[PDB]
Amino acid sequence: IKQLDAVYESKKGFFLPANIVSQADLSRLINSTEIQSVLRAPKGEARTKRAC
């Protein structure tokens, strides 16, 4: 475990990659206060009653 830092610090021309997302928990992002405060009101439900 101690050597595992050293081995990746010695690879030339390679750094540990940076991900394109910072938080992988979508539920936290969507259900966050910041997102939910600016959303519109819902336009419907999961199941819609058919009129005719």
């Binding site: 475990i1 101690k2 595992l4 830092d5 990746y8 540990l16 990659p17």
Partner: protein
Amino acid sequence: RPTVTVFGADGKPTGATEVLPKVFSAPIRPDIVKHVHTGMAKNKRQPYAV
């Protein structure tokens, strides 16, 4: 930084504590693994020809 506990020969924790070595936070990309694994498995083959 998160840490990990060390276990002795009997399976019980020994009180030693080590820091997670920063490579376990890397992105998990199965598509890269599949592409890299496909090529690396071919590097062991021996030629065949009639």
